[PDB]
Structures are given as C-alpha cells and as structure tokens.
Design a protein around this ligand. Sequence first.
Ligand SMILES: Nc1nc2c(ncn2[C@@H]2O[C@H](COP(=O)(O)OP(=O)(O)NP(=O)(O)O)[C@@H](O)[C@H]2O)c(=O)[nH]1
Ligand SMILES: [Mg+2]
Length: 452
Amino acid sequence: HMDFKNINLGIFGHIDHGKTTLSKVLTEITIDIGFSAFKLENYRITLVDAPGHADLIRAVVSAADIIDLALIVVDAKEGPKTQTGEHMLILDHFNIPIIVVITKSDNAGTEEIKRTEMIMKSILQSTHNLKNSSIIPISAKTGFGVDELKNLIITTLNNAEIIRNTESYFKMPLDHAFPIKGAGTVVTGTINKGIVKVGDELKVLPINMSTKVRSIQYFKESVMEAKAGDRVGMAIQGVDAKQIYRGCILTSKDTKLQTVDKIVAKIKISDIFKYNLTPKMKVHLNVGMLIVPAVAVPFKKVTFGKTEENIILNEVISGNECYCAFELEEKVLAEVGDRVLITRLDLPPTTLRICGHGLIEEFKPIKDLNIKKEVLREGKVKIDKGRTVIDGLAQSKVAAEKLIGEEISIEGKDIVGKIKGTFGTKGLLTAEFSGNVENRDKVILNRLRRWG
Ligand SMILES: Nc1nc2c(ncn2[C@@H]2O[C@H](COP(=O)(O)OP(=O)(O)NP(=O)(O)O)[C@@H](O)[C@H]2O)c(=O)[nH]1
Ligand SMILES: [Mg+2]
C-alpha cells in the first residue's frame, strides 16, 4: 500500500482547558503522559497527551524531546492562564511548531472567542520561533471546526522540516518499564536517533547493563526494525523492571552519551527582565528526562588579543554570550549539543517558571574554566599648582599603597601611564603618565582578577 510517515504530536495547556477531550476526539478517527494514535492522510500520528497540572510539569518538559509538532489549548472563555505560557515557552525554546487551539468555543460567544483569539495573537508575537502560528477555535464536544483543525495539522506537517536521524548511534529514553519475569522486561520509549533491529544487544544507563531486544512492538504490530521517530514497545532480556526507573536511557554500545556532573552550556535567556546574573545561583536544571538541582555561574568569553578568557558576566546581556557553568547535585545523562532547560520550579504554579535554555557546549567544572573577574575602578585626575593627583581609585592610604605600580589609562584621550606612589591619609595617588594630562580627567584602572 502507501508509505506512512511517523509523527509525534504533543498536546499542552492549562488544567481543564480541554486537552484530554481534544485527544479523544482525535484518536477515534492525567498524571502521566497519555499515548494514543491516529492517521491523517498518510501521517501516522502518535499522540502525546501532556498533564495540565503544574506539579506535573516535569512530565510536560519531558514530553517535548519526542514531538515534532504540538497543540496548545486555551479556553475560549477564560483565555490563557499561567501554564499556557510555560508550555508556550518550553515549545518555543525547543523550536517546536505549534498550532494554538481555542477549546470550548461552544461555551463562549463570538465576541469572547475573537477576544481570546487576539490575545493569543498578541502573545505569539512575543515569542521567538512561534512568531506567527495559526489559531483555530474548536469545540471538541460540538465538533465545531474540528474538521478544519485536522486539515491544519496536515498542512503544518507538510511544511515542517522533520529530520529523522538514522545515521548516528541508537539512542532511546525509557518512559515506563514493566516486568514479565526474572529473565525479561518490557520498556517503552520513542527513539531519538539511530536504528534498532530485533535481536540486537543494547544497554541501559546509567546503571550500565547489557541486554538484548526480543521484540519490537510498533503501532500495535510486531516489526523487525524500528527507526528514530518511532514510538516503540520493546522487550529486552538481561534486566529486571525494578532497576529501570524514570531517568533510564537505552542506547547502543557506540554511544556518545556520558553520565555527567559538571555542565557548561551556551545559555539564551527567556525573559531578560525576569533574568538575573548574580552568579552561583540555585536552580533546577532540566537534562534528558530528569530534573537535578544545580548551581550556575554565568560568564562570557572575551578575546584580549592573545588568549581568550572566561569572564564572569559584566551584567551586560548585550551580545549573546551568557555561558553558564553548571554544577549538578545529582548525576545526569547528556551529550554535547543537547538542548538544556533552566527552570526554577521552586516557585508557585501561578508564575512563569522558565529561567531559560541552552545548548551544552562542554562538560567541564568551574575550576578548570579558569574563571576571571573583569576589574574596573574609576578615579579622577585632580591637578593643583604643580602637582597631579588621582582620586577615587583608593579610599585610604593602605588601599592606595597596594595600588602602586598598576596600569592606568585615561578615558577618551588614548593615553597611557603608571601609578607610582601614595599621597595623603585620604588615599589619593600620584602617577607618571604621558603628558597633556588635564583637570577632571577620567582615570580607568584595569586588571584581571581570580573569581570566587
Ligand atoms: N463544552 C465543552 N467542554 C469541553 C470541551 N473540551 C473539554 N471540555 C470539558 O472540560 C473539562 C476538562 O476536560 P479535559 O480534556 O479533561 O481537560 P484536560 O486538559 O485533559 N485536563 P488535565 O489538564 O487535568 O489533564 C471536562 O468537563 C470536559 O467536558 C469542549 O470542546 N467543549
Ligand atoms: Mg487530561
């Protein structure tokens, strides 16, 4: 017959915004994630039903790595609520195509739908990748425009660039695992990269055991081979279902995966203004399917003409370099280039909880990055009759004497000099610099410091 294409479709939104009901209406043609399937044209669509509740947002994050498309639901009448945004954020950081779906249109008037419709359009424009994503009102109960919703899901998939990675090693996470006996265990999960054929030897991590694929169940059917993008049921032998829990990852023996403690990421910030750069900060880092508490130290990479140095952020977010050395409390399974998600989940469900996202560049501890502090103190040149004295670099005599012999330039005048001695008990300074110095000139003291 015809060749089908394997598609994962997310469904996100606030609690009671009509996710599940939309799910059921699609399937026929929430603590954990829901899993279902339906066909549209030659698209085999495996539905990922995300939990609305905000204590379950761990599931929501972990529902993103799988999907190539999503539906964000929002009640017509009461419009977007708090979770609607974090789901929106999450998908936007991970560059997942969305279709905003306005549910419960039968419970609202034309006016109230148009309002909420526009409110969404306003919001979508405040997001990087989701800038303009279609919007349809539907009623799952009434069937209103459900027909269109499907025709859109088709169009969207026809446009979106879906890259199945067959080439790299087999890499697949494990959602649920349930036993049969001591010599067998069945694990489910959608395949990230690579290929598996029945009777292959793979391995569970982080526990690092070696098992063999007895069965591939895909789409309620037993097949010899599975590919990346397929959500498969998998029976393997050489492990008990007890050892395998939420964070386990099934992959081949050529894997690039590593169990990691220290992470260095290239961080982009979600909302600037909610963002703060006070280093050595306590957050909850999302890697893979886990959430590990962490400490982050933001920094930038500035070439000084010879050697590139890692400089603790000067608080300027101008230019896109907010690298972040993470140090995790627990361990985590990661690879280079894996998208990382910085969250603060300590907060109430009522406030946006995403402290940003980024690509993992290196696995490296803060200590070996050679972190350094850009150090600037600013004084003024005060000149009386026959004497030049710099003021403001030092508050007292000791502070001043410690400064003697440092580097000093004058702002805007392209001139250099050196600070020789201390003048006064109030911490003034003397210097020998190039001539043509003037009163009320600006003196910029510059040096590199050991940070923390
Ligand atoms: N009139 C109407 N009611 C709807 C529609 N979709 C959902 N509802 C109602 O909304 C309520 C919650 O629906 P549900 O799909 O379970 O929401 P959910 O997002 O799955 N809940 P959760 O976030 O807990 O998983 C139910 O009372 C359901 O009947 C719809 O299209 N029309
Ligand atoms: Mg539900």
